Amino acid sequence: MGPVWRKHYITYRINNYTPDMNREDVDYAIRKAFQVWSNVTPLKFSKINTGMADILVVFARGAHGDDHAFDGKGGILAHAFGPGSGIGGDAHFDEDEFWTTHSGGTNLFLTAVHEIGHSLGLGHSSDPKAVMFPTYAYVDINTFRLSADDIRGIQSLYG
Ligand SMILES: NC(=O)[C@H](CCC(=O)O)NC(=O)[C@H](CCC(=O)O)NC(=O)[C@@H](CC(=O)NO)Cc1cc(-c2ccc(-c3cccc(Cl)c3)cc2)no1
Ligand SMILES: [Ca+2]
Ligand SMILES: [Ca+2]
Ligand SMILES: [Ca+2]
Ligand SMILES: [Zn+2]
Ligand SMILES: [Zn+2]
């Protein structure tokens, strides 16, 4: 029962890009991650390059300006703030990980689906098949599906 955006049009902006991947692949991973959630809700997401976005996607290292400092390679991979103005909604990814499009390193798409879930108001799930489960696991991203638990959670917040 976390906070929700009180609107169905939500903007995002990619503040900066990890050097681990090329720019087009970061854009693609993030766009696809948003699409996962838009597919089961009334929410629409538009990327903007200037202006005031609701959800700011950031790659940062260690102590990076909030009360959720990162811990170097491994451990916590990313974190996100629930809906709200300013820092609210923003999704932060630990640059000390090695972000990838694949099964090696840490898959950006999967991690982004999880974080965007928080950006929309979801908390963690106890279901090990849920993308909102607390621990990262790689799954073939081409056959990725939200679990029924994730769909339940997000539909309880929107629509
Ligand atoms: N322990 C680990 O396996 C890794 C470390 C690996 C390494 O060394 O690099 N670290 C984590 O998993 C950490 C643990 C942090 C802790 O609790 O101490 N967890 C994260 O980094 C989470 C932190 C968080 O909650 N941020 O909001 C981030 C996270 C969660 C996932 C996510 C993605 C897909 C799935 C999944 C699971 C089952 C099925 C499907 Cl389809 C998908 C469910 C979770 N992606 O990013
Ligand atoms: Ca924000
Ligand atoms: Ca880390
Ligand atoms: Ca990196
Ligand atoms: Zn942060
Ligand atoms: Zn989480």
Known binder of ligand: residue 2? no
Give the whole-angstrom CA distance, residue 78 versus residue 57: 11
- Mutating to test ligand 1, I would choose from 30, 107, 114, 133 the residue with most ligand atoms within 8 A of its C-beta, which is 114
All domains in the chain, ordered by first residue: 1-159 (3.40.390.10)
CB contact at 8 A, 10 and 88: no
Is 156 strand, coil or helix? helix
HSE-CB for 36 with a 13 A CA cutoff: 30
Q: How many CB atoms lie within 10 A of CB 44?
A: 12
Could you please report the per-residue DSSP string of 10-47?
EEEEE----TTS-HHHHHHHHHHHHHHHHTTSS-EEEE
Q: Give the number of residues written for the chain.
A: 159
Catalytic residue among 5, 59, 80, 115: 115
| Stated resolution in angstroms | 1.3
